[PDB]
Structure 1
Amino acid sequence: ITGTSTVGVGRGVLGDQKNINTTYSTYYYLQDNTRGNGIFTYDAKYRTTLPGSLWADADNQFFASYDAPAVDAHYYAGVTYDYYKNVHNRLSYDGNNAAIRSSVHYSQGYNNAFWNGSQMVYGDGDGQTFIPLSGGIDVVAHELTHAVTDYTAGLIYQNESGAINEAISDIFGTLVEFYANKNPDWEIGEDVYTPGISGDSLRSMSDPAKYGDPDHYSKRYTGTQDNGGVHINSGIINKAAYLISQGGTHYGVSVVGIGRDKLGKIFYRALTQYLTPTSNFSQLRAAAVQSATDLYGSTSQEVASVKQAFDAVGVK
């Protein structure tokens, strides 16, 4: 809506206070005009009709329990925008500063979050498996990264291309978490997953097998559940990404780590220049090798490490 840019203050899902960019016109709206063509956050009001209503608040203070998921969806969308712009020179998910829209309070007891083709959507969780999912910066960045993927590589959401799609969202979700630098790790969703259990997470990139996901191509899921295992086989690529960044010896194969910034550069370039909607794991390896070659040279350590990492997870 048309109005003037303002700065509100509120508390997120985990009880942390933060400033948020808002817009004043009669009400204060969760509309951040400081980034691209805006970041807009909506109330889905426990319904499934989207987007719901643009979040309106009387006083620009967002400390109510009901406000918390909105505060975090809005704020972490801003951090994710900043990551893509500052680190990769990418302006929003389409590269042209498309408005970023999110809805919170989607459905009832909803243990998931998603990109629906046009916007981000966050459940509140059931309080057992999840608390409101926008409380995780890696989750928010995971969702916005689906939009980036859809506008670029266009990876079809099934089988190997879908597992790459998932891994790309976990990788950049994690790199955004490191960018913000608050309790960063190589785990996925730990801040909002299972409030009754400390120290777990939905997935692990450093050790996918800890939560049942394969860490080697020979252990890939070949069934039909989960669109052919997109959230399962992502572990194979997540592990390769982890190894490229941090190094390690995995199934006897040693990888020299090159750090998270170079991981990000290599995978961003692969995603935006080389991957196609039907890319499989072998084709991702080739894309990553080519990207590292473009950036660092064919004889580089970076290229050598990409090859070792994919070798370690059994992808040729």
Structure 2
Amino acid sequence: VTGTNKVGTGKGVLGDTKSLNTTLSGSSYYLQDNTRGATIFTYDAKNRSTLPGTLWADADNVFNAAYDAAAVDAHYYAGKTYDYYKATFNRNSINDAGAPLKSTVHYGSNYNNAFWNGSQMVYGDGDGVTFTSLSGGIDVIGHSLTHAVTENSSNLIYQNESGALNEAISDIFGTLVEFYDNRNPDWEIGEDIYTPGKAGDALRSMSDPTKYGDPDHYSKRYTGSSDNGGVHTNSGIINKQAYLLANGGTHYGVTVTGIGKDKLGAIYYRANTQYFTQSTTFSQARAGAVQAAADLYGANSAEVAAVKQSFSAVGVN
């Protein structure tokens, strides 16, 4: 759509007020953001298994209706994920070429899943029990757009260790985006959307992978065909490593001194864009991460030391 930029207001999935960038055309306001280097579109699938759906249109530029919630967050958070990458690494969208960011909410009926399908974000509204509208989780969104980022960079195959690393990178950056927007920061994934009723729980833990039965050390890795080689469980290994590198701690004898989340992002972004390949394994991931930290902070630095410590702590060498 083509019109005038406007700033509307709405309430997200969690009932919080957010400022939205909309476009005014005719007597309607559309969920179209024209304020950033990449246009952000948000569609409505009207609870049908169709894509992308109709571009969200509103009459008064006030999205406070319950049906709006999913759209509000999807539109807002997508822009925030864009802000993080642009502000921090000066990356212009997923393909570093201004590719538009489209999102479709209200997909399917009680669909408990949200994902980047290769060209856009697709969100379900959950079944109310195990999930609420999945767009209410900034870490989940950062995770998914990062997948696009990886597709346009290292292109890690979603299989075995390459896949587990692919997932880890997404978790690391999803959390980093959560911190960027100060959206009640933590190292747990999907806490804001998982089980609307039960509080305190999450999809998985970066601080303590074993809290949900995930490997926090290479020795305890899943060695089977299921889940594309345990992609979603073995990611706990790298996630723990990432956590240790950022915050520091003692794990399996090894005592790591945290170098901060900012340096963490710098190291992984560089490693993923200038070193990691499609079949990168964990040990190779260690190699690339160390080299990246070497470039950014000097071969004989405290950072490079901490990188090595983190991997040794989780059993990768």
Which bin holds the TM-score, normalised by the shorter protein?
Answer: over 0.9
* 2:188–2:206 contact (8 Å) kept in structure 1: yes
State the partner residue of 1:189.
190
Percent sequence identity over matched residues?
73
Name the residue aligned to 1:23. 23
Paired letter, 1:216: H
Alpha-carbon shift at residue 4 of structure 1 (Å): 1.3
| Superposition map of 1:4-153 within 5 A | 4-26=4-26, 27-153=28-154
Q: Secondary structure at the match of 1:109?
A: coil
Rounded Cα–Cα distance in structure 2 between residues aligned with 1:47 and 1:102: 15
For residues 243 and 199 of structure 1, what CA distance do their matches in structure 2 show? 22
Which runs of structure 2 are paired with 1:299-314 in the superposition (5 Å)? 299-314=300-315
Q: Distance in 1 between matches of 2:226 and 2:55?
A: 35
CA deviations over 1:40-61 (Å, ceiling 9, x no partner): 0111111222111111111111
- The number of aligned residues is 316
Distance 2:149 2:165 in 1: 13
Q: Is the contact between residue 49 and residue 107 of structure 2 (CA under 8 Å) also seen in structure 1? A: yes
Contact 2:38 2:92 in 1 (8 A): no
Mapped to 1, the partners of 2:301 and 2:38 lie a distance apart of: 39
Letter in 2 for 1:295: L
Partner Cα distance (2:187, 2:201) in 1:
12
Quote the Cα distance in structure 2 between the aligned partners of 1:158 and 1:105: 30
Residue matched to 1:216: 217
Could you tell me which residue of structure 2 aligns to residue 297 of structure 1?
298
Q: How far apart in 2 are the matches of 1:272 and 1:24?
A: 38
Question: Could you tell me whether the CA contact under 8 Å between 2:138 and 2:183 is conserved in 1?
Answer: no
SS for the counterpart of 1:114 is strand
Q: Which amino acid aligns with 1:9?
A: T
Q: Does 1:159 align with 2:160?
A: yes
| Contact 2:9 2:18 (C-alpha < 8 Å) held by counterparts | yes
Q: Aligned partners of 1:224 and 1:64: how far apart in 2?
A: 45
1:256-299 deviation line (CA, Å, top 9, x unaligned): 11010000100010111101111111111111000000000111
Question: Following the alignment from structure 1 to structure 2, what is the Cα–Cα distance between the partners of residues 45 and 280?
Answer: 41
**Per-residue Cα deviation, 1:50-73 (whole angstroms, up to 9, x for no partner):** 111111111111001110010000
Deviation (angstroms), 1:182: 2.7
Query: CA 1:37–1:183 in 2, change beyond 3 Å: closer, same or farther?
Result: closer
Report the secondary structure of 1:44's partner residue.
strand
What SS does structure 2 have at the residue aligned with 1:154? coil
Aligned to 2:264: 263
Task: In structure 2, give the amino acid aligned to 1:16.
Answer: D
Letter in 2 for 1:60: N
Task: String of CA shifts for 1:289-314, please: whole Å, max 9, x gaps.
Answer: 00000000111010000001000111
CA drift of 1:35 comes to 1.1
In structure 2, distance between residues paired with 1:234 and 1:47? 32
Letter in 2 for 1:270: A
* Matched residue SS, 1:66: coil
- Secondary structure, counterpart of 2:67 in structure 1: helix
Q: Write the letter of the residue equivalent to 1:213.
A: D
> Matched residues in 2 for 1:112 and 1:281: separation?
28
**Residue 253 (structure 1) shift:** 1.1
Q: Work out the CA distance in 1 between the residues paired with 2:129 and 2:298.
A: 49
Other-structure match for 1:283: 284
CA RMSD after TM alignment = 0.8
3-state DSSP of counterpart to 1:24: strand
Letter in 1 for 2:95: D
Residue 4 of structure 1 aligns to which amino acid in structure 2? T
| Runs of at least 5 residues in structure 1 that lack an aligned partner in the other structure | none
Q: How many angstroms apart in 1 are the aligned matches of 2:113 and 2:216?
A: 24
1:204-235 CA distances to partner (integer Å, 9 max, x unpaired)?
Answer: 10101101110011111111222211111110
SS class of match (1:228):
helix
Contact kept, 8 Å, 2:42 with 2:75, in 1: the verdict is: yes
- Helix, strand or coil for the counterpart of 2:115? strand
What is the CA-CA distance between 1:37 and the residue it aligns to? 3.0
* Structure 1 consecutive aligned stretches of length 4 or more whose deviation exceeds 2 Å: none
| C-alpha separation in 2, matches of 1:109 and 1:13 | 15
